[PDB]
Amino acid sequence: RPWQILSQALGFPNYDQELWWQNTAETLNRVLEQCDYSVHLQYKYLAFYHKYILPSLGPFRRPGVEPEYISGLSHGGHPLEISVKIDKSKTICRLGLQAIGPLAGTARDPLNSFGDRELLKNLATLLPHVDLRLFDHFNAQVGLDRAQCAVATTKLIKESHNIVCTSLDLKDGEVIPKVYFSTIPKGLVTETPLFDLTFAAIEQMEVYHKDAPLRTALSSLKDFLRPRVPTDASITPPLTGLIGVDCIDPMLSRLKVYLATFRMDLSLIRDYWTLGGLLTDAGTMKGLEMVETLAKTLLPFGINYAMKPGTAELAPPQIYFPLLGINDGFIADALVEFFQYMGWEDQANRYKDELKAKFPNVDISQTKNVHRWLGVAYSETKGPSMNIYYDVVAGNV
Amino acid sequence: RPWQILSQALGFPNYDQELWWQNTAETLNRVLEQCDYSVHLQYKYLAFYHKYILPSLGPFRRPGVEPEYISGLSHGGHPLEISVKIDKSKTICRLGLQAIGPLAGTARDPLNSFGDRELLKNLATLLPHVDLRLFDHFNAQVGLDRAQCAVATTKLIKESHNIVCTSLDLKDGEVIPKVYFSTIPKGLVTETPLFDLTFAAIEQMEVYHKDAPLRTALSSLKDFLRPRVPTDASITPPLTGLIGVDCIDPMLSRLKVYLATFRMDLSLIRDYWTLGGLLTDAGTMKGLEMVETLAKTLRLPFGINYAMKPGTAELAPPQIYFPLLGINDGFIADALVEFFQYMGWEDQANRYKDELKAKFPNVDISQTKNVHRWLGVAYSETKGPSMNIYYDVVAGNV
Amino acid sequence: RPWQILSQALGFPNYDQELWWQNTAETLNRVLEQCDYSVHLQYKYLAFYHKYILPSLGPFRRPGVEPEYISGLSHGGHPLEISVKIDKSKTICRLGLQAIGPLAGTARDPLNSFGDRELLKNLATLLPHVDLRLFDHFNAQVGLDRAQCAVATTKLIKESHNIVCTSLDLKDGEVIPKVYFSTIPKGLVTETPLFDLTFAAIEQMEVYHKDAPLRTALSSLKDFLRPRVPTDASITPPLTGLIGVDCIDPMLSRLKVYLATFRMDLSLIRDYWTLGGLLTDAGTMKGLEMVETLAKTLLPFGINYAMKPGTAELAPPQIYFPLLGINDGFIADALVEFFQYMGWEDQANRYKDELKAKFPNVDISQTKNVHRWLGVAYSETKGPSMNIYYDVVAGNV
Amino acid sequence: RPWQILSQALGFPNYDQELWWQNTAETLNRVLEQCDYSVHLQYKYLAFYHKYILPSLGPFRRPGVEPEYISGLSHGGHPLEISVKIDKSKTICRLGLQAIGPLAGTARDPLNSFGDRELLKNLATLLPHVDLRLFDHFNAQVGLDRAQCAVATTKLIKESHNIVCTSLDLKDGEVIPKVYFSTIPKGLVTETPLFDLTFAAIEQMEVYHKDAPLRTALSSLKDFLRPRVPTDASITPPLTGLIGVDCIDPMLSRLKVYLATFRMDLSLIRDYWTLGGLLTDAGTMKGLEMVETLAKTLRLPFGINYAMKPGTAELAPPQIYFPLLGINDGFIADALVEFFQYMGWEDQANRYKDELKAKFPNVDISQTKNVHRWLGVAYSETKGPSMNIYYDVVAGNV
Numbered sequence A, C: 001r002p003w004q005i006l007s008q009a010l011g012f013p014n015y016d017q018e019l020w021w022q023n024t025a026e027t028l029n030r031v032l033e034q035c036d037y038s039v040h041l042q043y044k045y046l047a048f049y050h051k052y053i054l055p056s057l058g059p060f061r062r063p064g065v066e067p068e069y070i071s072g073l074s075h076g077g078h079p080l081e082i083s084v085k086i087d088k089s090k091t092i093c094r095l096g097l098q099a100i101g102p103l104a105g106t107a108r109d110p111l112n113s114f115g116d117r118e119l120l121k122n123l124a125t126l127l128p129h130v131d132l133r134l135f136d137h138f139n140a141q142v143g144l145d146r147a148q149c150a151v152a153t154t155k156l157i158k159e160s161h162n163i164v165c166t167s168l169d170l171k172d173g174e175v176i177p178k179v180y181f182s183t184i185p186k187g188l189v190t191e192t193p194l195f196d197l198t199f200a201a202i203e204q205m206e207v208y209h210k211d212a213p214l215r216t217a218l219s220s221l222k223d224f225l226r227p228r229v230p231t232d233a234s235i236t237p238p239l240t241g242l243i244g245v246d247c248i249d250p251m252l253s254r255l256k257v258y259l260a261t262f263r264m265d266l267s268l269i270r271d272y273w274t275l276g277g278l279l280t281d282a283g284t285m286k287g288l289e290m291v292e293t294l295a296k297t298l299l300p301f302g303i304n305y306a307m308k309p310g311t312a313e314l315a316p317p318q319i320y321f322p323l324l325g326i327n328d329g330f331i332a333d334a335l336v337e338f339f340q341y342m343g344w345e346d347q348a349n350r351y352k353d354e355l356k357a358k359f360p361n362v363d364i365s366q367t368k369n370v371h372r373w374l375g376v377a378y379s380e381t382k383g384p385s386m387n388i389y390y391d392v393v394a395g396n397v
Numbered sequence B, D: 001r002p003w004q005i006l007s008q009a010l011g012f013p014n015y016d017q018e019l020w021w022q023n024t025a026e027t028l029n030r031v032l033e034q035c036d037y038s039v040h041l042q043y044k045y046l047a048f049y050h051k052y053i054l055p056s057l058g059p060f061r062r063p064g065v066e067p068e069y070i071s072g073l074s075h076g077g078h079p080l081e082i083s084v085k086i087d088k089s090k091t092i093c094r095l096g097l098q099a100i101g102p103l104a105g106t107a108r109d110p111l112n113s114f115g116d117r118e119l120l121k122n123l124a125t126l127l128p129h130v131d132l133r134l135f136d137h138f139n140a141q142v143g144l145d146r147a148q149c150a151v152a153t154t155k156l157i158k159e160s161h162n163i164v165c166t167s168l169d170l171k172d173g174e175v176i177p178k179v180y181f182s183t184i185p186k187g188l189v190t191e192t193p194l195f196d197l198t199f200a201a202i203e204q205m206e207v208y209h210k211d212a213p214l215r216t217a218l219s220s221l222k223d224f225l226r227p228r229v230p231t232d233a234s235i236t237p238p239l240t241g242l243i244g245v246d247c248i249d250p251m252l253s254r255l256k257v258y259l260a261t262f263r264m265d266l267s268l269i270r271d272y273w274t275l276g277g278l279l280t281d282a283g284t285m286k287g288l289e290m291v292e293t294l295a296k297t298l299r300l301p302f303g304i305n306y307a308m309k310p311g312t313a314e315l316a317p318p319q320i321y322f323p324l325l326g327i328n329d330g331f332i333a334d335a336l337v338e339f340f341q342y343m344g345w346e347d348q349a350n351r352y353k354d355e356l357k358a359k360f361p362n363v364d365i366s367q368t369k370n371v372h373r374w375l376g377v378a379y380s381e382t383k384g385p386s387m388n389i390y391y392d393v394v395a396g397n398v
């Protein structure tokens, strides 16, 4: 099996990397098999994961060994998630991580400011299509000096001592990086409103200055958000908490503005999904039925407005439902029912057996931590989609 | 001696680092001694150099071993310079380099786009006051993807396959990084005028949006440069070829706009120094006599560097850089002694030649023409006159 | 293809490693395909080669870039060879290299004394069955301090500034290391006879002291060699120039004593093969016919006497014929004829097309450097074998 | 100060190295100052420590972070000791460590079999006089394959999962390595008596075969030890538990055979020191009074170390090591002052307590019982009396 072959061939530089492999790689290889990646792509991705991702993941938190840096990405504080993006026809595997520098969570690096850019630099000599210009732009806008980072750690819980995180889409035989920047540490430290920081950083992008359509989309977005998020410097949800970009040509990159809120009823779902009455068309409304049916059939909620250069009109967001604390057997039964509702008969018939087989060390009918998030979207061109985000480590124990 | 002691204590991870040390570290230790750094600071800076700078310098170009990446920083293609900044009261040592990545000058990294940021990342965990925000800003504005980098190499000579370089001021017991970004590769690849892209990148700075004084200074600078540099996309002089920042809090960083030109007579020196008649005050005019006297007392382009700081609205006179490559180093030393006497820097005059000899003991500096590379001169209202001398250390040692 | 997939997944830490891959890995993957290794084993070996062997190979000598260390292993000074061991039924791929330290061929490391042990140390945490005790034993016996190493470089050509080299058999899904130690630098520097050094080092082995059979074999070997090699300190072939061991349990390791000579006529072949009349049995004589037929159908010659603990009697040696300077098209036609002589019809029918396909950048009917060595052996239990050693780099240009 | 200056210049690759430095480097710099090393040598040894020793020390065991490998070298499981060797005329500083590989104490490396040789390889390219031949010889004789290593861990406590450790004498402006190999894991796994395997490994040395004097010394040693240590495979005292060599030319290396025992009265001290009546001369007998006086003036085993050199046929008296773990460090200091007065080392007596305090400023050394770990004493005919004091640096700093 590819994960086993690579272990045999490569070994491990240190014990932390060995443990990360022993607790994630079998699962990943299972995911890639189940999403119908060829064997050559299984090897591609697993070898990549070994060489580039294992060293970025830092120490493997476990009984008796408490890392200086604790991630918010998972229940046990491990900076890793594996996610699937499901259509009608295909499923795509993705990794989400924080790349942990070797002084992270200590005075020389209080918010783990460097690990993600170091990974991306390695990715840029590895991969011909990786572009760091949007990364560098937002790092310059929302990054903090060391003194500022220290101040931020006094005002945030241990699981939120971070500015950046990274995802890698394993798609089209390639690795496609995306990054997300948190606005919160900068908001806190400079006592600037999150709304102003977020849009100030966006409006200084080189692509913003060249693309009139993007400027039109953002002004619509701004007009929707301005009345709904704080005008002052509080961290009072609903709030503009992350900015997302693809690490590709800035003209092709999607710009992502993520709201976080703890409150989500039907009125709020409607309001977010339709941008307050702005989107009334039949595609948007079909999406909204889907989201409402999902809520019925079933950490902050997330609303992610994604914009692309050359497009003047906003689309409906992706909405993220937190699943931490809900039984994983129930979630699986709920998703099967939702998949039948969508007419995704093949996804419905396989979901629960393939979930078991991803996570053989665990009884999903007893766990509550393995599904962490679910995102749903509807695109005008691409159709409906579902993202399921798993705490791999929780599922491997 | 410190450079010897660190060799014995540290050794070398590879032969290229050993050769770098053997061709630069004696000289550097000499310079620090001559600028009256304490012994503890000599160790501090030499140990730092060994740990952080040696691995960043790449292969040591020499007969039989042609690196894939050739730097424009020195005559022999070595990515290193050492410079001294001389006042009346003190002398400061500084290093200039390019941090060479391990695939530099090959298809995976045609313009050496990553080494400098990697060095700076290491400097940020080392040093409590290092800030990368201006670095990242300009890297986003003037940097290029791989395909663009490959295009750029087809339009530039081998010595100009670069976007960034780094300097380290060894001052106040600290290491203070500065970086410089070339506008040329982006100008060439996007077929944009250098003036436009330089100012477009500056005007998108976070500090530009917060600081009215800086905007005002740049607006005056723009009015002066717009008529004097190309409005088209040519690389002809005078041109806006580099943008410089300090890797510190953006509010305290100096923003530097560097012109390169090959033509420099007395009228041009006047025009640059006074910003075309804009500066007429007595401090400016004293600076101008000094610079005129230097030009009289004495290939690469001339440089003119306008340096602007947040919170200051008015432009100051630039620093002017005289190129010295190809002029005998014994002559340059005699000229500098005379200039130092003119300034009333009697102590600097009396020591300059003997210290020059002692900086470069393994080569007869009176026979060479490549060791002094540049000379910069400035006058500040608050600081007084200054001189920067930039040496091709490797040419002084091989 | 696996070599391509790994390139894509892994990239390269530096340009030298990239060039080594671009000039050897396609060939290796071709060899492994032709010897019928499964795809999973192709990935195993190619991933291993990338992680462990590429960094050990040092700079890639090429026009404009002259390394400080020049290896004798190949025509262009590259420290690599790939070899095949051919039976009737199977073919085994092996790598031979010198692991180049980062100060090799300079004053801090004049004979490249450290790179091979550093590779083996990495192999010992990678592989459960690797044993370093025989390595360390012979390193202690024939290794030299820095001053001695400097003296040795003044008395040897640049291509002989070495004490150790390494081979890796790619067999049974495993990597099996072997090492060879040169007696010459120590002989030269201490003005000790090679015969005395070689046997002194052997007789101080822990296994020699425990195994009466081995002591009996070596005393027979000593009685054969003593009259035929110098009693003085000259490097006058025939001479005892290398000692070989397997990096496994000392009780299972074969101990190999290699003679080098520039003179090889029928009388000498006979004398070496039969240990001077000592071996007269029908197995030995069939071997000898085979070797004689090979010579007829077609750097020093090599004679390698291999002994194993628990066996009191000597076996016939392996004899190594240097092929440098003989046309590679001719060698292929000669080997095809020899394979027919042996009744290895399948090996005969495939040898020349598979040779072409290993080395697609080159016209074998014009080159003289690609076959470097041929070894032949006959074992009482295992049967006849042939080892062919290729200059991979010469074959890739 | 040098330890501060190197921190500022070098920083740390990871937090474990930072913590090591923060808990040992001040103390080390203190020791070097107190032994009258020049400032240049302080830098030399501190820079060396940073580059070569910090990464070899592994994780820094502390509350909340339990490393996979736990060393027996110190009370807190930290693989480091600092020791001073005191004469009448000088004091020499030495480091003892285990070089912790990155899979140590796990299935891929159960007895930490590789870190020490990796450090020594780095030392061989650093230092012109380092020689690995004796290291490799004993590693071949007493080392174990992985399966054997896993068996050994089932028969030994966690603090004894080791085969090798390393010491570095900081002497003559140089670093001189020594290594020690434990015979215990091989004794246990092969069910061989410790006496037999110790001498079997020694007798296969290349130098043993060339040097009649060394063979004669060992033959006398064997006659003395054979009746006193087990003839069976038990780990009971007295036992031959370590073999020591210098990593230098085998002809100049001292070969050290160390006994460990828990029982030490005046008759036993006499028996060990005189090799059972074998040594009766006036130098030996003066040494013996000294050692008797030390025992009177004052848990781990006692150590007795017989040290033999090629070209010497006759045995000398051993060095005897008194274990001090569990005895108050204020008391030990008062005892040593008294012993120093007895020796007529008035200067050593007058400074010992104040320097002890200043070596360990972040802990009150009068309250601790773990800081002095061992005391060794020797007498040479050619060299005079000596004392080695071994400190648990980490226990003195945390």
Ligand SMILES: CC(C)=CCSP(=O)(O)OP(=O)(O)O
Binding pocket: A085, A096, A167, A178, A180, A304, A373, A375, A387
């Ligand atoms: C960081 C979290 C929990 C979600 C980010 S939204 P995403 O990038 O995972 O979703 P897409 O890949 O854009 O479909």
Ligand SMILES: CC(C)=CCSP(=O)(O)OP(=O)(O)O
Binding pocket: B085, B094, B096, B165, B167, B178, B180, B244, B305, B374, B388
């Ligand atoms: C890199 C070159 C040739 C010139 C840079 S100007 P500088 O930064 O060296 O001069 P100052 O340090 O600003 O005085």
Ligand SMILES: CC(C)=CCSP(=O)(O)OP(=O)(O)O
Binding pocket: C085, C096, C167, C178, C180, C304, C373, C375, C387
């Ligand atoms: C070093 C050279 C050219 C030959 C060594 S003999 P070998 O080990 O390659 O042959 P075997 O693998 O023992 O059949």
Ligand SMILES: CC(C)=CCSP(=O)(O)OP(=O)(O)O
Binding pocket: D085, D094, D096, D165, D167, D178, D180, D244, D305, D374, D388
């Ligand atoms: C490692 C331990 C506890 C004792 C070793 S004896 P030593 O080598 O430290 O003493 P000397 O350096 O030989 O004086």
